[PDB]
Design a binder for this molecule. Sequence first.
Ligand code: ADP
Ligand code: ADP
Ligand code: ADP
Ligand code: MG
Ligand code: MG
Ligand code: MG
Lengths: 84, 49, 97, 371, 371, 371
Amino acid sequence: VPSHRRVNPPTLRMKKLNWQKLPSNVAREHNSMWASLSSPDAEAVEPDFSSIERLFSFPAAEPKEITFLDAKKSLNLNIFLKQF
Amino acid sequence: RELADYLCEDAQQLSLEDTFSTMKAFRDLFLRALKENKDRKEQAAKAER
Amino acid sequence: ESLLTSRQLPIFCQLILRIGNFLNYGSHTGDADGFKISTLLKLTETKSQQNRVTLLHHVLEEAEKSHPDLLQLPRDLEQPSQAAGINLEIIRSEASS
Amino acid sequence: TTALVCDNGSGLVKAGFAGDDAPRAVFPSIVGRPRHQGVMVGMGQKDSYVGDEAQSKRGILTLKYPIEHGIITNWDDMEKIWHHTFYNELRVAPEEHPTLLTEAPLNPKANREKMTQIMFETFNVPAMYVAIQAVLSLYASGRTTGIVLDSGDGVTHNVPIYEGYALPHAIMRLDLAGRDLTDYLMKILTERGYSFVTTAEREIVRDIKEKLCYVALDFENEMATAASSSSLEKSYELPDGQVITIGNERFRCPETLFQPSFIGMESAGIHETTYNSIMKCDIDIRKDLYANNVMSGGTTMYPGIADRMQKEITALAPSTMKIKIIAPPERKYSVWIGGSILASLSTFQQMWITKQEYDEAGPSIVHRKCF
Amino acid sequence: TTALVCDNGSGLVKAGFAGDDAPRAVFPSIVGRPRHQGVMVGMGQKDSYVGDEAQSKRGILTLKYPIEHGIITNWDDMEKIWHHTFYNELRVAPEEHPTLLTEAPLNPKANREKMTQIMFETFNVPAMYVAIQAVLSLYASGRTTGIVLDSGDGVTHNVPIYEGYALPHAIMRLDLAGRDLTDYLMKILTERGYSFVTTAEREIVRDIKEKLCYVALDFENEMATAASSSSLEKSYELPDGQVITIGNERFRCPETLFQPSFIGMESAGIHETTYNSIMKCDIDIRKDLYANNVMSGGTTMYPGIADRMQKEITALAPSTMKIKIIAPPERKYSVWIGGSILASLSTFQQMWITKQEYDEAGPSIVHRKCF
Amino acid sequence: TTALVCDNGSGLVKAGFAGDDAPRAVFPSIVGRPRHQGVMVGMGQKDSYVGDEAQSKRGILTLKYPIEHGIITNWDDMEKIWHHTFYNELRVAPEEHPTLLTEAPLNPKANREKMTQIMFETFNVPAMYVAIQAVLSLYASGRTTGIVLDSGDGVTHNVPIYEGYALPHAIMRLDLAGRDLTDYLMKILTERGYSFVTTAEREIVRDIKEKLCYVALDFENEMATAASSSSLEKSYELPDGQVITIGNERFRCPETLFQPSFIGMESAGIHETTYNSIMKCDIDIRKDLYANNVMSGGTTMYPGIADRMQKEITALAPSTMKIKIIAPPERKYSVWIGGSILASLSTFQQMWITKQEYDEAGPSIVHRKCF
Ligand SMILES: Nc1ncnc2c1ncn2[C@@H]1O[C@H](COP(=O)(O)OP(=O)(O)O)[C@@H](O)[C@H]1O
Ligand SMILES: Nc1ncnc2c1ncn2[C@@H]1O[C@H](COP(=O)(O)OP(=O)(O)O)[C@@H](O)[C@H]1O
Ligand SMILES: Nc1ncnc2c1ncn2[C@@H]1O[C@H](COP(=O)(O)OP(=O)(O)O)[C@@H](O)[C@H]1O
Ligand SMILES: [Mg+2]
Ligand SMILES: [Mg+2]
Ligand SMILES: [Mg+2]
C-alpha cells in the first residue's frame, strides 16, 4: 500500500528540498526499511500540511519633558544630578 | 550487509563510518533544532510579557 | 542493531517522505519510494519566509504537539553517534596482527 | 540618538556616551560573592556585589573576573557586568541606544557569537557593533597610518595599518598583560616577606603596581643600582596600617612585558612582536610604521616605557631611519576616545548591525559584517 | 590650436603640448588596486590608484601594467590611464585639441582598431594621428636619413629610413626590452638572497636597474674583473632602510639585449638585428645607415650602450665604411620631441584623421592613412 | 662502495643507501633545547636533543627548524642534523661513502657554497652531488618527459623536463608549503578555542594536519556543506586526553596551496604555477607535459589533491589534450628513491664531485658541475 505517495498537490509554489532520490527497484528489497514502511500495519504520522503550506511557500510581490539642551549634556546632567 | 540492504545502499560501496557520521550530524542537528525552538519560544514568551 | 531495530526512525522517514511528496510535487524528484541517508543533513536548507525557522525546527515543533515519541529519537541514535569516528579497518588489522 | 562606547576589557569596564572627552563610568570588572556565614538579619544583605561596591566591601568577598585573556569564561557574571554598566552606572536604557563594543583580535568565534546573542536578546538594542581596539586607538591618535600596540589587562596585541588598510597576516596576539604582571608581583612580593593569597589581596597588589612600579630604561644597570644602594626603594601603606618598602620589584614586575620567560612563556617580548609585525608587512610601508608607534592601554602607563621601547626598536630597526613612539598623556582611555569619534562619525552609520539584519541572518552576521 | 603629444609607451606615459621642447607630464603607466582589508571608514578610499599615486602608495597595492610587449592587454586600465593623462595631469579638454599617438611596428591590427575607436568615441578629439616611434625619433634627430633602434619597455624595434622613405621589409621587431630585463633582474637577485616577488618590489628592482645597471664594453673581461676583485660592487638603499649590494648583476641584466638566450629566446641580439636590418636593404643605401645609427628609448639610457653598439656593429660591418652612433642626451623624450616637431609642421595639417573621416569610413581609415 | 642518499628537506630528513627501495632513516629535522630549569642532577641531561628524542621529549623543549623555505638559516643546527643522520641513525662512516644531496631550485648560491664547504671539510666525503629534487622525482617515476611539482615543507617548485632536457627559464619557485599550512592551521584553530602557541604544539598541529586534513574537490560546495551540517567534522585526541573536533579546517588548511591570499601572499596558486611553467616552454612539447604531471613531496599526501589538480589544469589547459596526473602511492619518498636510482647508475659515476676537484677549485665547482 503506497501510503507515503498519497499526498494532495499544493496550491502554492514550494521551496524545493534537494535530495538524492533512490531507484524504486533498489527500494523494494526484502530487508529494506522502505519495504517495512510499505506494509499498511506500520505506524504512520499524518503531517499538518496547512502550516507547511502557510510558512514554507514562496513569497509574492510628544512633549512630555521639553528641554533646550541636547541629549548628551542632559544625560550627563542626569548622571551628575542623580548621585546627590 | 543487513544495514546495506536496510538503508537500500550498494553493499560493495557502503561504509559504516560515513553512515554513523551522518547519524551523528543528524542527532546534533536534532538537539540544536530543539534548543533553538526552546530559545525561540522562551524569547517569544518574554517579548509577549 | 539499534539502526536495524529502530521504531521511530522509519516513522520519521515516512513523515519526511510525505512532507517532500507534498513539497516537491511537479518536479523530477517527486513521487519517490525512498531516498539516501544525506537528506537529513540538508533539512536546514529549506527556510521560512522570515529566514528564521527551518523545516527541521517546524517538524519538531509539530512533533512536540501531535506525536511526542519522535523526541525519543536521540536515544536510538546515541549509539550511532558514539560509534561514529571509529575506523573498523585499523582495529581489525591490529587484532589480526 | 547618541551612541554608547563600552570598552569591556579584562580588568576595567570603560563606558560612556559618544562625543564626550572622558569615559564617565570607569570601574573594574569583578563579581563578588560572600564566603563567610552571615549572622545579622535584615538591612539588605545582597548575594552578589558588582563594581565599586565589590571593591569597597572586598574583605568578606571572593572576587571573580568574568573575562580571562579577552575570552569571557563565565557568562552570567558578564551578564551582571553589562546589567550594572547599563542600568546602574550610566543609568540608560539599552533599547534606545546604539552600542560599540571592543574586542581583541584572534578571539574564538563562539565568544563573539555569545556576545552578539546576549547583547541582542537580553539587552536588545536598535544597533550594536564589535570593533578592534587597535583601530580605535589609531582613531584616538588622529592619524591614518601606524602600528598599534594595545595592552589591556589580559591581551597585548599588535596591529599595523597603512592608509586605512590593516594587514591581517601581520596581526599578533600575546596573552600577557597587567593581570599576569599582578600575579607575578604576587609571586615576587613573597620574597620580601609580604604574603598575599586571596582575591582581595590581588587588588592591593594591583594598587601597588599602579602606584609604584615603573619601566626600567636598562634592566641590568637598574638591578645593579638597586643591589648596591637603597635609593630606588619606595614605601606604601596597606589598609591594615602596615608600611611596606619595595626595591627591585618596582621594575622587575613590568619587565615581564619585555621578557616573557619570567612567567614561563616561550614567546618573545613586545618589542620583538612589534618588529616582527612590521617585518611581516610589505616593504614600502615599513618606514611609516617606524615613525608612528602608537601605544594604548593601561599597561603602557608606567613612566619609563616609551624611551625603553624606543631604545629596543631603535636597536632592532635599521639605523638610517627615525623611530618615534606616539605615547599620548591620555593613553589609558584612548580605546574609549577613538570609539567616541567612530561612534560620532557620519560614515559609520551604515555599518551598524541592526536588529532586523540580526533577525534575518541569525547570529552569523557578526563574522561577515565585523572584521 | 596647440596640439597635444602623448607618447603612450610601454614604460612611462609622456604627454605635453606641441611646440615645446620638454614634456609636461611624465608619469608611469600602472594601475594599482588594493589587496588588503580597509578598516578605517571614510577619508576617500579609492578602489584604484593610477599613475603617481599608485607609485607613492605601492605597499598596499597590486600594480598592473596595461601594455605587455607593445600590445594593450587590459583596455579599462588604459581608459583610466588616458583619463588620468588628459584630465588630471595636463588638465585640458580633449575635445578642443588634437592629440598625436605613437605605436610600435609589427603590432596586431586590433590594437590600432581599438585605439581609433576609443579616441573617437570616448576621448573624441577634433583630429589625431598614430605614428611609428622610429620615424618620430628620426624627426627629433633632425636628419632625413638614418636607422633607428628604439627600445622601450616592451618592444625593441629596428627601422631604417633613407631620404624620407622607410623600407617596410627591413623593419624588425624583438620582444625584449626593459620589463624583461627587470624580470631577469628579479630572477638573478635571488642568487644573493634578496627575494623580490611582489608587483611593488618590481618597481624597486626597476629603480635598482635605472640607478645602478650599465652595459659592459666586454662581457668576459667584466666577469674576470668582477670575479677577481670586488671593485664594481655597489650598494643600494631599500625603502625599509635595508642596504643591499650587487656585483656582476649590474651588467648581467642588459646583456640579455645582446644575448637573448639568457631568458631562453632563440633570437639573436639587437646588434645582429640591426646588422640584418641594414643587410636586408639595398646595396646603395647601406653606407648612410652605417653612419647614422640613431638610438632612442629609456633602455638606451644605460651609460655603456653606444660604445658596445659601435664595437659590435664595427665587428659585424665591413671595416671600410664608417660606423657612427647618434646618441643625444635627450633621447628618452625624443619620441615626444619628434611628435612635437611633426605636430607643429605646416605640411602635417592635411594628414590629420578627422571626426568626419572616421564617421564616413569606420575605424578602418587608420590602416590606409597611417603607415 | 654503496652510495648514500640524504634528502635534507625543510621538514623531514630521509637518509638511506643506494640500490634500496625504501629510505632507512626517516626523522624530522628539528633541534630541541631545554627552556625550563633542571633540578635533578646527573642522569645525562643533554643541552640539545635532535630528531626523534626531541619529538618524544618536546614538552620541555624549544624546537627550532634549521631550514626555512629551503634556505638553511642556522648552520650549527644543520651540522648537528647531519651528525645525527650519519653517526646515530644510519650508523655509517661518511669518509668512505658517497652521499647524494637534494636542493630546491632558485636558491641563494651561498647556501650551496656553505653546504659544499661543510660537507667537504666537516663531513668529508670521497665524493658527492647536489641535485634538483624534481629531476630525482622524474627519475623515480621511470619516465623521461613530464613536469614535476614538488612540494615539501618549505618550497613548492615546478620544473618541466622533456627528453632529459630541463628548461631553466620555466622553473617556478613558490615559498608556500606544509610549514605555512601548519602556521595557518594554528591561526584558524584559534576560532574553535584551541590555543596552540608553543613550538611543541606545532608538532601537534602538524599531526592534526597529517591525520585529518584533505584537499576539497570543490571548495565552495564544501564550505556550504560545513556551514549546513556537521557530518564531515572529525575528532582528534590530544596527548593530555582532551578530544578536539575540527570541521571546515580540514580543507581550509590545504586550500592555501591553491589560494595563496589566505596568508597574505600576492602570488597565484600551484595550478597556475604549473600552467605558467608549461606555457613558458615551446609549443611542440606541451602535449607531453599535459599528460605527465608528476607530483611528489609530503604536501601531496592529502587524499583529494590529484582530482583537484586534474580539474584545475583541465580548466586551464585547452580541452583537445589529455590531462593525466602521475601520483604514485610512494611519492613521499620518491625524491629519495630516484636518488637511489641515480646513485646506482653506471653513467653517473663520472659526474661525482671528487675531493681533488674541490681542492683545486675551491667551493666553486658546485656551480659548474651541478645544474
Ligand atoms: N597608572 C597606571 N600605572 C600602571 N598600570 C596601570 C595604571 N592604570 C592602570 N594600570 C593597569 O592597566 C590595566 C588597565 O588597562 P585597561 O585597558 O583599562 O584594562 P581593562 O580595560 O581590561 O580593564 C589595569 O589592569 C591596571 O593593572
Ligand atoms: N636612467 C635610466 N637608466 C636605465 N634605464 C632606464 C632609465 N630611465 C628609464 N629606464 C628604463 O627604460 C624604460 C623607459 O623607457 P621608455 O622609452 O619610457 O619606454 P616606453 O615609453 O615604451 O614605456 C623604463 O621602464 C626603465 O626601466
Ligand atoms: N600523511 C600525510 N598527510 C598530509 N600531510 C603530510 C603527511 N605526511 C607528511 N605530510 C606533510 O608533508 C611534509 C613532508 O614532506 P617532505 O618532502 O618529506 O618534507 P621534508 O623532506 O622537507 O621534511 C611534512 O612537513 C608534513 O607536514
Ligand atoms: Mg582594553
Ligand atoms: Mg617608449
Ligand atoms: Mg622534500
